[PDB]
Nucleic acid binder design. Sequence first.
RNA 1: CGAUGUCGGCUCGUCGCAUCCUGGGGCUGAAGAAGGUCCCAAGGGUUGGGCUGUUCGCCCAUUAAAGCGGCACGCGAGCUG
RNA 2: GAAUGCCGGCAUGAGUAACGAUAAAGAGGGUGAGAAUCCCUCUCGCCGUAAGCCCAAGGGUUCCUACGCAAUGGUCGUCAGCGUAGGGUUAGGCGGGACCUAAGGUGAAGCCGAAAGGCGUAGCCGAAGGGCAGCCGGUUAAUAUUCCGGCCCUUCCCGCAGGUGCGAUGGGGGGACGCUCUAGGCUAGGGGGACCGGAGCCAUGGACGAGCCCGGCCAGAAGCGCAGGGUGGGAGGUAGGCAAAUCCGCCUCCCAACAAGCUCUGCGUGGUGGGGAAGCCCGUACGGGUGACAACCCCCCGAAGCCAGGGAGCCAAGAAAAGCCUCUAAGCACAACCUGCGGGAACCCGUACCGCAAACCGACACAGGUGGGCGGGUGCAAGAGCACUCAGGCGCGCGGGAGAACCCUCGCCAAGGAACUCUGCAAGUUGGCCCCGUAACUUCGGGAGAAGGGGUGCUCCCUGGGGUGAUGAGCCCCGGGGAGCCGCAGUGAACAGGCUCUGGCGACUGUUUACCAAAAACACAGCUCUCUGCGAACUCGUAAGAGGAGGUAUAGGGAGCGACGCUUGCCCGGUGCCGGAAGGUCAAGGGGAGGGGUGCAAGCCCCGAACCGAAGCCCCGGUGAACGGCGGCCGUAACUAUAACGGUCCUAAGGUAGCGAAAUUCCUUGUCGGGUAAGUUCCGACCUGCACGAAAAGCGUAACGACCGGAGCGCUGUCUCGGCGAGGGACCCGGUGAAAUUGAACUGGCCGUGAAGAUGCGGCCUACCCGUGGCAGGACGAAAAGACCCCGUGGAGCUUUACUGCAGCC
RNA 3: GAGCUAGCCCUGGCCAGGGUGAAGCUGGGGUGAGACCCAGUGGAGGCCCGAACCGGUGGGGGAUGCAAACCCCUCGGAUGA
RNA 4: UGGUUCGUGGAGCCAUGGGGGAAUCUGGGCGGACCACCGCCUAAGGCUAAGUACUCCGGGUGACCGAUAGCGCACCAGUAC
RNA 5: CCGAGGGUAGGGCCCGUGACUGGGGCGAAGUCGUAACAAGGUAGCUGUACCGGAAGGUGCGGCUGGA
RNA 6: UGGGAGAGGGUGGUGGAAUUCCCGGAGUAGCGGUGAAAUGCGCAGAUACCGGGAGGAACGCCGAUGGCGAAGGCAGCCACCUGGUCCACCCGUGACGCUGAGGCGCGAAAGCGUGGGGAGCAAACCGGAUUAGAUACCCGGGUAGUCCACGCCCUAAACG
Lengths: 49, 272
Amino acid sequence: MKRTWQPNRRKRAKTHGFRARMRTPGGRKVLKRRRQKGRWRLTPAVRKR
Amino acid sequence: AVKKFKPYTPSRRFMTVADFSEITKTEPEKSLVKPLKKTGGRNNQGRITVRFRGGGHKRLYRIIDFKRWDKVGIPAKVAAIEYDPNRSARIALLHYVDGEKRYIIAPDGLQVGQQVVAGPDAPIQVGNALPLRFIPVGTVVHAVELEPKKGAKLARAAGTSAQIQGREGDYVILRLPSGELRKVHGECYATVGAVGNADHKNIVLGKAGRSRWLGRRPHVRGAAMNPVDHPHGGGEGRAPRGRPPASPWGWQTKGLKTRKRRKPSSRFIIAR
RNA sequence: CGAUGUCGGCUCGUCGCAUCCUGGGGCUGAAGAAGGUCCCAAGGGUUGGGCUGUUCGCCCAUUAAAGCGGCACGCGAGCUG
RNA sequence: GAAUGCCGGCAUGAGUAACGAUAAAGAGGGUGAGAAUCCCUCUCGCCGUAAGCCCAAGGGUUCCUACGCAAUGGUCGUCAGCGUAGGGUUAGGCGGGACCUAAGGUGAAGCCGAAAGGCGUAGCCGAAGGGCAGCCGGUUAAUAUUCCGGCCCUUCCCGCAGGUGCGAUGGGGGGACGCUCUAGGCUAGGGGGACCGGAGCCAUGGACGAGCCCGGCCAGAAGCGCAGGGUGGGAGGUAGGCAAAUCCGCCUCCCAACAAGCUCUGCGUGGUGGGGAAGCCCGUACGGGUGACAACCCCCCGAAGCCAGGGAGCCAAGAAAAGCCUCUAAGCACAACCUGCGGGAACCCGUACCGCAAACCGACACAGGUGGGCGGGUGCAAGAGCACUCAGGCGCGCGGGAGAACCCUCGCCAAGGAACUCUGCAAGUUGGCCCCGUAACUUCGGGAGAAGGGGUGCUCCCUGGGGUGAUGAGCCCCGGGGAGCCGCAGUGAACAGGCUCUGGCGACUGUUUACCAAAAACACAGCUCUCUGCGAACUCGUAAGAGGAGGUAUAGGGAGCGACGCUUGCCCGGUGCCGGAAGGUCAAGGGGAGGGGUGCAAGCCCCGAACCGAAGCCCCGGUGAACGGCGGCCGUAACUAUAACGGUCCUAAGGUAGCGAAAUUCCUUGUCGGGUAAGUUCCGACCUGCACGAAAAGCGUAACGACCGGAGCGCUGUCUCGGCGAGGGACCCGGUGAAAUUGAACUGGCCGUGAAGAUGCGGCCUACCCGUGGCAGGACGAAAAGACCCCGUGGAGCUUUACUGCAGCC
RNA sequence: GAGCUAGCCCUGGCCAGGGUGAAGCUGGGGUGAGACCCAGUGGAGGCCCGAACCGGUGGGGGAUGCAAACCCCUCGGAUGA
RNA sequence: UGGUUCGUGGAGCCAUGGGGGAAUCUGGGCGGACCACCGCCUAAGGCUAAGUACUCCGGGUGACCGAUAGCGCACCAGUAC
RNA sequence: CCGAGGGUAGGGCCCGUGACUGGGGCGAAGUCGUAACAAGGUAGCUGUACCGGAAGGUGCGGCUGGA
RNA sequence: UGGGAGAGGGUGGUGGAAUUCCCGGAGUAGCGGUGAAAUGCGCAGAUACCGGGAGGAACGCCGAUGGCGAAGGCAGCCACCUGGUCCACCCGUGACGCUGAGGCGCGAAAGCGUGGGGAGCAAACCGGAUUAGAUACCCGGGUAGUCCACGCCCUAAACG
Ligand SMILES: [Mg+2]
Ligand SMILES: [Mg+2]
Ligand SMILES: [Mg+2]
Ligand SMILES: [Mg+2]
Ligand SMILES: [Mg+2]
Ligand SMILES: [Mg+2]
Ligand SMILES: [Mg+2]
Ligand SMILES: [Mg+2]
Ligand SMILES: [Mg+2]
Ligand SMILES: [Mg+2]
Ligand SMILES: [Mg+2]
Ligand SMILES: [Mg+2]
Ligand SMILES: [Mg+2]
Ligand SMILES: [Mg+2]
Ligand SMILES: [Mg+2]
Ligand SMILES: [Mg+2]
Ligand SMILES: [Mg+2]
Ligand SMILES: [Mg+2]
Ligand SMILES: [Mg+2]
Ligand SMILES: [Mg+2]
Ligand SMILES: [Mg+2]
Ligand SMILES: [Mg+2]
Ligand SMILES: [Mg+2]
Ligand SMILES: [Mg+2]
Ligand SMILES: [Mg+2]
Ligand SMILES: [Mg+2]
Ligand SMILES: [Mg+2]
Ligand SMILES: [Mg+2]
Ligand SMILES: [Mg+2]
Ligand SMILES: [Mg+2]
Ligand SMILES: [Mg+2]
Ligand SMILES: [Mg+2]
Ligand SMILES: [Mg+2]
Ligand SMILES: [Mg+2]
Ligand SMILES: [Mg+2]
Ligand SMILES: [Mg+2]
Ligand SMILES: [Mg+2]
Ligand SMILES: [Mg+2]
Ligand SMILES: [Mg+2]
Ligand SMILES: [Mg+2]
Ligand SMILES: [Mg+2]
Ligand SMILES: [Mg+2]
Ligand SMILES: [Mg+2]
Ligand SMILES: [Mg+2]
Ligand SMILES: [Mg+2]
Ligand SMILES: [Mg+2]
Ligand SMILES: [Mg+2]
Ligand SMILES: [Mg+2]
Ligand SMILES: [Mg+2]
Ligand SMILES: [Mg+2]
Ligand SMILES: [Mg+2]
Ligand SMILES: [Mg+2]
Ligand SMILES: [Mg+2]
Ligand SMILES: [Mg+2]
Ligand SMILES: [Mg+2]
Ligand SMILES: [Mg+2]
Ligand SMILES: [Mg+2]
Ligand SMILES: [Mg+2]
Ligand SMILES: [Mg+2]
Ligand SMILES: [Mg+2]
Ligand SMILES: [Mg+2]
Ligand SMILES: [Mg+2]
Ligand SMILES: [Mg+2]
Ligand SMILES: [Mg+2]
Ligand SMILES: [Mg+2]
Ligand SMILES: [Mg+2]
Ligand SMILES: [Mg+2]
Ligand SMILES: [Mg+2]
Ligand SMILES: [Mg+2]
Ligand SMILES: [Mg+2]
Ligand SMILES: [Mg+2]
Ligand SMILES: [Mg+2]
Ligand SMILES: [Mg+2]
Ligand SMILES: [Mg+2]
Ligand SMILES: [Mg+2]
Ligand SMILES: [Mg+2]
Ligand SMILES: [Mg+2]
Ligand SMILES: [Mg+2]
Ligand SMILES: [Mg+2]
Ligand SMILES: [Mg+2]
Ligand SMILES: [Mg+2]
Ligand SMILES: [Mg+2]
Ligand SMILES: [Mg+2]
Ligand SMILES: [Mg+2]
Ligand SMILES: [Mg+2]
Ligand SMILES: [Mg+2]
Ligand SMILES: [Mg+2]
Ligand SMILES: [Mg+2]
Ligand SMILES: [Mg+2]
Ligand SMILES: [Mg+2]
Ligand SMILES: [Mg+2]
Ligand SMILES: [Mg+2]
Ligand SMILES: [Mg+2]
Ligand SMILES: [Mg+2]
Ligand SMILES: [Mg+2]
Ligand SMILES: [Mg+2]
Ligand SMILES: [Mg+2]
Ligand SMILES: [Mg+2]
Ligand SMILES: [Mg+2]
Ligand SMILES: [Mg+2]
Ligand SMILES: [Mg+2]
Ligand SMILES: [Mg+2]
Ligand SMILES: [Mg+2]
Ligand SMILES: [Mg+2]
Ligand SMILES: [Mg+2]
Ligand SMILES: [Mg+2]
Ligand SMILES: [Mg+2]
Ligand SMILES: [Mg+2]
Ligand SMILES: [Mg+2]
Ligand SMILES: [Mg+2]
Ligand SMILES: [Mg+2]
Ligand SMILES: [Mg+2]
Ligand SMILES: [Mg+2]
Ligand SMILES: [Mg+2]
Ligand SMILES: [Mg+2]
Ligand SMILES: [Mg+2]
Ligand SMILES: [Mg+2]
Ligand SMILES: [Mg+2]
Ligand SMILES: [Mg+2]
Ligand SMILES: [Mg+2]
Ligand SMILES: [Mg+2]
Ligand SMILES: [Mg+2]
Ligand SMILES: [Mg+2]
Ligand SMILES: [Mg+2]
Ligand SMILES: [Mg+2]
Ligand SMILES: [Mg+2]
Ligand SMILES: [Mg+2]
Ligand SMILES: [Mg+2]
Ligand SMILES: [Mg+2]
Ligand SMILES: [Mg+2]
Ligand SMILES: [Mg+2]
Ligand SMILES: [Mg+2]
Ligand SMILES: [Mg+2]
């Protein structure tokens, strides 16, 4: 059947990107938490040009 | 007149379509004056706030003239009468000698080629606009302003009118389509005649689809729902209500008057 | 009750006898034929349909007879539902 | 030592199930330490509106090459999408960006919110939509509309030369638009050819023939030709297009009304450029050479694609902005722009490979899911259907035997045909097209494919229409008539309704519980009630704001009923709602008669009765397509029987019409009638309606249904009642090799007993040790800390005239 | 968290081939003028048959599956809600 | 209404959203309703070290652990997945 | 070829019959009420509509076969 | 040819009286109603009176025992559009006539469909009296209908 993962680079970027997270206090805290944690990747790596 | 069909299909046996014979050879509209992009959307910034809206034909807005006092004294020739997707009535395309082209909402009896004009001057004829004062008591009228210089707001639906009843210092009394008795300021413009396309009420949609074409989504009964959804939801195999009939939001829907009492508008109203 | 799947049908049986038929027998209000009733006897047999989920029952057409009951109201790691 | 404990290790089931579509394999030769599995050749099979090509998304080195086989590959592996290394992705014209705007996002002005923040016309962002200039070939092991070859374009910048009042983010034009049906002419694509070009080939009885086989094209500036799209030309007047216009708009006269003329495309032709089979020969993992000075011509079919902004009809009435044209404003007119010609300038990112799939989403080389375009030929009425088959790509990464039970899928069957069963479930019968022929009923459309029939191949003869060609040959489409031939059978294979009669329910097409319910449930047109005069009612939001709606009573919200026909009775006592400037009750506040506390006192501080005080409630009315309700008991007619009639109690009033053993009837398989040999079902009646009834509508209704019930015809393996056969498994051999489960086990029957259902206890009976294929009675077998029941002063969702609050309204 | 699913908004695309034959046109008939009636033309419809596509009716299979919804046969819609 | 031990209590004091609304030393607040007396303070402007909290970081010590312990991580871990 | 007739399939007309049901006719002396004929004690009749155990009542317009 | 009477028909418009409801004034203790009453309305200010406003329907006097139309039927007034008909003159045609199966049109009231309207009246229906009982007569309310447009319906003591 159709499963739940339907990859889209634009969506992944607009949805979970560094700039989206930065836009709101909710998201800014996510970066803070991930930084303090020592996460190698703050936001998902969306590729291609 | 109303177009009628033979039952060559079920739902074609009741279906019924407007007569478009008053639609003069001018079916597609007029750029310049209108159209605008019209912005379909069944809801506010976010959430739906009027249920069951959506779908249905794309539209172009015809930006019509609801304040006729710009062109006081300037007459215009009625050039055409065309279909307007965004109202029950039809619209008149008129050419002002000025050059300017406006649409007026098209009254019953309006003929193409006719002369029409607005102002204190203005022969009392079908199509003309006047401040309510100079209009003879008892004449039927439409596109009436509520307060002066604020635009036509009463009687624009197909086949509607108001009748002038009497006067009272600065106000003339109106009898509105609903039957209400209203004091409306003398200085309010209103155009003589009834609205026309009066056979609009006689049309039978005929099937579900037609409803959808006009963007009317299926309306579901409270009875059909559940207690979470509606006061009428549940219980077992059908149910008669079990309380005084209500809206989904709990207010009673048979009888409960809802106009706020202390409206300052009150001292200008005399009926139902 | 940290689970013993619950009616009826189907398949497969097997057991009790307080025997439906078939074998033996006494009494009969047993002339004969046919019954009645009781004793002995389970070796084998105990049909096909209509209606109903039915068990059961009521009917149709037959039969030597169309027996009753137990086996977790036998049988769902055999089926049905 | 236990916690269905936690982590780790290792066992049991077990050499057991399985090895992922039943499209299929065989042999010869290589290579190699080692081949069913890798390379080659031959034969065989499968796909071919794909299982073949081309894009887009996603993926991200998987591409190509060399050397490798530990692991990954459900076996093997010399192979590989795997390991190591090296190479590979080339653009002014293709896509995206130094262009535009959509929803939406953002957001200076501004508005709002304890804070965080929420709104917000301008602007900006935002795209497979608008705009915009490259086609055909050739080369690489791997890139090419990118490189190279030919042919052809696009902007910019500077020059010259010639024109013109040039000139904006401002004005106007345009861009610019639906759905269905379509005409004319073309192209893509395809078929045929006695014609042109070709290596070859006469096999096995015949054929040296207008024989077989293969191929007879592509791109292309200017100019022409042929289609077709766009468009009127003047001159006055002018007060509108938010400054100004010569533009546009609106008047008024002239000449056009034609596409005549201007342009603009498409398609042919075009200087020139390029491609060019079979077969034969070669060494490939593949391409190369020859065929070749290849030929490159004529007919026919022909688009859903082009001309494109074509035409016609219809109602539901069908984006925006820029490029572009035009008009003028500041300014500037030694400027600038326009045309032609020269020279120069032309960036950023993507480009490999997979792409219906072993490279994407599904933990997997997963029988699932994935948007767009090309998708050949023949035949069957047509087609993207179906059978076979080009190009092309495959035989689905375990095989070899055997020929048991049983299972899956499939084929056939004597006689009987539903006796099967909850049910004709399943399976069969029927089946395409042409021609006759069709009932009740009906809303006059339907019901209709009703039902039921006949025809269907091939050969020869005659003959009627078109289409393309000229008014003809041919080539292609449709027809008619007459003789005749063959078989069991002519839509000879594949794709293709069983039918009727009668009820229930719902009018109908639709919708629904993704993953057990598709329905009589929802929706639905239509009916009615009610609210709402517009800063509307209502909805979201603390607000701002927003929807409603750029709507205005023929409109908008809420409720119920639910096409249509005929209709929808009585009760307003209670609840609700609506209406009542009287009265009772009623809070803060006003009011202070009167009383209290302290002071030597002026004073200060307390309570505090009249009386004045809203809404609400009380009270008075109204209102049922508002919540709802719509009786009991005795007696009476000249056979009995029954009760039109009467008496009486109670009610707010005592169910009308219509229907009724029902989707409603307990007693019930009520009782008659009908269908049957037999009928708890079905249909028709009766009415004693436990416990119908009129918009939670009542009674009907043609049509409609994967809805539910009853009946009959047809047909059958459903059955009597089985039998045979096929393939995929099961079985045996080689390879790889799980699982839940598991206190340990040396794990027999009977009759007892025991916590009441014993392999394990008693007595007796029986029984050598160990396997393999089978069957499922038991191990109260496995599986889920029962979901029923009860318990816990456990939890949630739901309701109300339970309590208490809050939003909200007054 | 709406990359699944539900709804709506903007912008595109897709629906082989066949049937049936509404209005309206045109001719004739009819009348005082009509209605209306015959053809012919026309090509309407939540119309019909049926692929793609969208479903999921009944049965079988599958049940440590190919699959945590699958497969085979059958069936519904297929110019529209 | 909040704060304080103070839950309307005899409820002051300290803050305050609403309404009314003064005075400048013989002016004003407080000492738990209120009043008298005796007293204590001087609101409606602001700044002010130290003594106190913490431990990302450096060091010292341990009747602290010793790779299932000790931080999740002694090991290229907030990694693989 | 045609063809008596047989068979299959579907219709048209007519007759008989059917639980139950509709009114009708007739049947010397049953019940209920009093509608009509006198001005019938509400003048009567009427087409239609609704309602009522029943005659009948009432709405609407009409008639003299009444005043 | 020339005249004349008429509620003959259709459309558009308009006038006053009266009834009801609303508003304001004034005004009180009863009004309505019948054979008699009661229901009902009224100190929440009825009835009666004055003023203003709204709305619908029907046209007093003229009016007749009258006129007109084929019948059904037609009545305030005005204008348009229009049918029939009688007189005079004897001017034209020249037998063109009468009747009429069918057909076709018209056709009171009630009724029906769609939409509008709704003052008064008023089936059904609710009450109050009467009665043995009243589903009637009489009284107080009252919905369809009565009105209009369009479409049906085709009945009558459609009677002279
Ligand atoms: Mg525009
Ligand atoms: Mg937002
Ligand atoms: Mg609904
Ligand atoms: Mg429900
Ligand atoms: Mg609720
Ligand atoms: Mg119920
Ligand atoms: Mg309820
Ligand atoms: Mg238990
Ligand atoms: Mg257990
Ligand atoms: Mg168990
Ligand atoms: Mg015995
Ligand atoms: Mg004996
Ligand atoms: Mg039993
Ligand atoms: Mg037994
Ligand atoms: Mg028992
Ligand atoms: Mg049992
Ligand atoms: Mg068992
Ligand atoms: Mg099992
Ligand atoms: Mg069941
Ligand atoms: Mg222990
Ligand atoms: Mg373990
Ligand atoms: Mg085993
Ligand atoms: Mg085995
Ligand atoms: Mg095996
Ligand atoms: Mg395989
Ligand atoms: Mg095959
Ligand atoms: Mg094949
Ligand atoms: Mg790699
Ligand atoms: Mg490779
Ligand atoms: Mg190699
Ligand atoms: Mg291997
Ligand atoms: Mg594998
Ligand atoms: Mg090797
Ligand atoms: Mg590699
Ligand atoms: Mg740049
Ligand atoms: Mg940009
Ligand atoms: Mg932009
Ligand atoms: Mg925008
Ligand atoms: Mg915006
Ligand atoms: Mg914002
Ligand atoms: Mg673009
Ligand atoms: Mg480009
Ligand atoms: Mg390549
Ligand atoms: Mg210029
Ligand atoms: Mg411009
Ligand atoms: Mg512009
Ligand atoms: Mg030979
Ligand atoms: Mg060419
Ligand atoms: Mg100007
Ligand atoms: Mg070559
Ligand atoms: Mg066009
Ligand atoms: Mg712009
Ligand atoms: Mg490339
Ligand atoms: Mg590529
Ligand atoms: Mg594809
Ligand atoms: Mg594989
Ligand atoms: Mg796959
Ligand atoms: Mg697909
Ligand atoms: Mg094709
Ligand atoms: Mg075919
Ligand atoms: Mg196919
Ligand atoms: Mg047989
Ligand atoms: Mg046979
Ligand atoms: Mg038979
Ligand atoms: Mg049977
Ligand atoms: Mg049986
Ligand atoms: Mg059945
Ligand atoms: Mg079947
Ligand atoms: Mg049916
Ligand atoms: Mg249905
Ligand atoms: Mg679905
Ligand atoms: Mg489901
Ligand atoms: Mg299902
Ligand atoms: Mg269905
Ligand atoms: Mg909101
Ligand atoms: Mg708004
Ligand atoms: Mg709006
Ligand atoms: Mg409404
Ligand atoms: Mg309903
Ligand atoms: Mg319903
Ligand atoms: Mg219903
Ligand atoms: Mg009712
Ligand atoms: Mg009541
Ligand atoms: Mg009430
Ligand atoms: Mg009341
Ligand atoms: Mg009230
Ligand atoms: Mg009060
Ligand atoms: Mg009954
Ligand atoms: Mg019942
Ligand atoms: Mg019987
Ligand atoms: Mg019977
Ligand atoms: Mg009911
Ligand atoms: Mg009801
Ligand atoms: Mg359906
Ligand atoms: Mg049926
Ligand atoms: Mg069988
Ligand atoms: Mg076999
Ligand atoms: Mg083996
Ligand atoms: Mg042993
Ligand atoms: Mg035992
Ligand atoms: Mg022992
Ligand atoms: Mg023992
Ligand atoms: Mg067992
Ligand atoms: Mg068991
Ligand atoms: Mg438990
Ligand atoms: Mg229970
Ligand atoms: Mg308790
Ligand atoms: Mg026609
Ligand atoms: Mg069609
Ligand atoms: Mg259809
Ligand atoms: Mg279909
Ligand atoms: Mg406190
Ligand atoms: Mg104080
Ligand atoms: Mg103090
Ligand atoms: Mg003190
Ligand atoms: Mg102090
Ligand atoms: Mg550790
Ligand atoms: Mg260790
Ligand atoms: Mg750890
Ligand atoms: Mg009969
Ligand atoms: Mg009889
Ligand atoms: Mg009498
Ligand atoms: Mg009388
Ligand atoms: Mg009488
Ligand atoms: Mg009556
Ligand atoms: Mg009468
Ligand atoms: Mg003469
Ligand atoms: Mg009539
Ligand atoms: Mg009438
Ligand atoms: Mg209607
Ligand atoms: Mg009255
Ligand atoms: Mg009365
Ligand atoms: Mg008469």
